[PDB]
């Protein structure tokens, strides 16, 4: 489906391209296979991200990367990429709203859930090498607000920064007051306790 949409969206193919019209065009790779070139990378990326957020043609699992300096667009449908969900910040305000929060907190007898949150374009899956073209904010109500301007172009936001810890390190209380070897030792000894 990604290849079909690329063909529909005016992407010149390699065998139909003169070797002179490639210097100013951004190459397109799909699963590491060079499939063509395009001349409007910004609009192409906007359309692809919109389609992935609507969950219409491109599954939420697919990642899209634009290397602005090197003029390359890379799209991966591969299996084995590791990704985590992130909130979406449009201008400076989260797309997550109090209506979403209420519909979530009435989750029982309402059939509204995480899939219905994802389908609304509120959250998104970001793999590791798509994280290199994103600007993250650790806390919404602290980093989106007006300050002495550090960054005013945030592109995502963290759900909660404590979700960076594994199963065995999520049981340590106040791990930010500890020492890293001590946290590692507790992660080791949590698999030996008797209960």
């Amino acid at each position: 489906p990604i290849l079909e949409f690329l063909e529909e969206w005016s992407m010149e193919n390699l065998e139909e391209i003169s070797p002179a019209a490639i210097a100013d065009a951004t190459k397109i790779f799909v699963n590491g296979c060079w499939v063509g070139i395009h001349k409007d990378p910004e609009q192409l990326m906007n359309t692809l991200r919109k389609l992935r957020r609507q969950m219409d043609i491109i599954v939420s699992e697919v990642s899209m990367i634009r290397d602005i300096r090197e003029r390359e667009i890379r799209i991966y449908t591969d299996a084995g990429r590791i990704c985590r969900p992130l909130l979406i910040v449009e201008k400076q305000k989260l797309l997550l709203k109090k209506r979403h929060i209420d519909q979530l907190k009435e989750r029982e007898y309402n059939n509204y859930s995480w899939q219905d949150l994802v389908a609304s374009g509120v959250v998104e899956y970001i793999d590791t090498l798509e994280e290199e073209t994103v600007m993250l904010a650790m806390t919404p109500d602290d980093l989106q607000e007006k300050e002495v301007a550090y960054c005013s172009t945030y592109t995502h936001c963290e759900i909660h920064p404590s979700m960076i810890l594994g199963v065995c390190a999520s049981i340590i209380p106040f791990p930010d007051h500890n020492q890293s070897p001590r946290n590692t030792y507790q992660s080791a000894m949590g698999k030996q306790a008797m209960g």
Binding site: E131, E132, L136
Partner: protein, 96 residues
């Protein structure tokens, strides 16, 4: 502003990094000295450090004042991502 002048025997990056690390080490040591000299005569950290039982003034400093700089392979934290340490920072940020 290119106004920094290199030190003989060092590159521009080397002299910039040396100045930054020196400033930060001075800050950490000064805060440590303040934390030490602000202790009390009943403090148990002081009891276990002065007598030589277990601990050190650097441990007291890290508990009270400042943990300090983190280094990897002897250098500051490297640029794991494309020209930045984490996705939460702008590109080319050399702040503390």
């Amino acid at each position: 502003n290119n106004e920094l002048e290199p030190t003989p025997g060092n590159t521009l990056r080397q002299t910039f990094e040396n100045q930054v690390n020196r400033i930060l080490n001075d800050a950490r040591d000064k805060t440590g000295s303040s934390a030490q000299k602000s202790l009390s005569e009943y403090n148990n950290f002081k009891s276990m450090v002065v007598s030589g039982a277990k601990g050190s003034k650097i441990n007291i400093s890290q508990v009270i004042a400042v943990v300090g700089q983190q280094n990897v392979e002897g250098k500051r934290i490297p640029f794991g991502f494309k020209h930045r340490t984490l996705p939460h920072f702008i590109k080319d940020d050399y702040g503390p």
